[PDB]
Nucleic acid binder design. Structure first.
Length: 276
DNA sequence: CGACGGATCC
DNA sequence: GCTGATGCGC
DNA sequence: GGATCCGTCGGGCGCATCAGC
């Protein structure tokens, strides 16, 4: 069945106005995403913080339009040291973070430009392109170790301000998070190993799924669709993109959106509204 | 990884 | 510089 | 035999390299 994201709730449960909008988007090729008119959707969306994943683009090769967004002038980029054309993350902010760091503090996992940490006054933001388990599950065991190191890095993130984890976590937590869970329990992103790791992220850090807290039984809500067999036209997809938040932030949670109409990638943009 | 084809199931 | 084959990873 | 279970195949994209010119 198709999916129409409910209208934006730009007010919290206590009637407080959204002071912060964050947009996360796996662009599957930032230079391609821009030629495909992706920055135009960002302009219309006017986010305060824009997190991008799978940039596939080093810093010296970023298109000049990216350095022309005035409401997103604070830009921070991370790419693999060896694999050019692979992975890559980005954080564009209206206001300068107090602190910007890269990696989960672990050499085995900090080589593929997958994590940017940005400390703001009231919260700590973390964008992530989590390792894929791969065709045939070749990189599953690596994903399992990444999960362990990520869980630990996040739980002890130095200080005590709430956490907003955003990005491509590369798993569909439960069966409601993908069209075909039965034929994908042995396919990357639906292995029980990965699904349990997400569960442990939630219990250990701890964190909550913004979208699922608001929409616990909303089906067909996906963020990724294979380009193959035009899976997007039939909404056969997976929710791999999320905003996970400390429970301290749930009183500030106005909404968590899925922008199913925005094109440019095999992923759709997600958006969080927060009243801080 | 969605689609498909074969195998099995009551 | 520019394109197309080839390879690799989603 | 309609419905379900499950393994195999073939394929959309982006970007890198390299050759040729």
């Amino acid at each position: 069945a198709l999916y129409e994201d409910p209208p934006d709730q730009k007010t919290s449960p206590s009637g407080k106005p959204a002071t912060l909008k964050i947009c996360s988007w796996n662009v599957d090729g930032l230079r391609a995403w821009i030629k495909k008119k992706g920055l135009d959707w960002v302009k219309e969306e006017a986010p305060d913080i824009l997190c991008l994943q799978e940039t596939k683009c080093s810093e010296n090769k970023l298109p000049a339009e990216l350095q022309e967004l005035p409401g997103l002038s604070h830009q921070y980029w991370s790419a693999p040291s060896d694999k050019e054309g692979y992975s890559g993350v980005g954080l564009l902010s209206r206001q300068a973070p107090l602190k910007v760091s890269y990696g989960i503090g672990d050499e085995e996992h900090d080589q593929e430009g997958r994590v940017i940490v940005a400390e703001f006054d009231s919260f700590v933001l973390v964008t992530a392109y989590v390792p894929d388990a791969g065709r045939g599950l070749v990189r599953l065991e690596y994903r399992q170790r990444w999960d362990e190191a990520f869980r630990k890095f996040l739980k002890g993130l130095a200080s005590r301000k709430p956490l907003v984890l955003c990005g491509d976590l590369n798993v569909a937590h439960e069966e409601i998070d993908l069209r075909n869970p039965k034929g994908n329990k042995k396919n990357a992103g639906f292995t029980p190993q990965e699904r349990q790791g997400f569960g442990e992220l939630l219990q250990a850090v701890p964190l909550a799924d913004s979208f699922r807290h608001l929409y616990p039984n909303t089906p067909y809500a996906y963020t990724f669709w294979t380009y193959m067999m035009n899976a997007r036209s039939k909404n056969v997809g997976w929710r791999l993109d999320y905003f996970l938040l400390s429970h301290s932030l749930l009183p500030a949670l106005c909404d968590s959106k899925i922008r199913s109409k925005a094109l440019g990638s095999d992923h759709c943009p997600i958006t969080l509204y927060l009243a801080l």
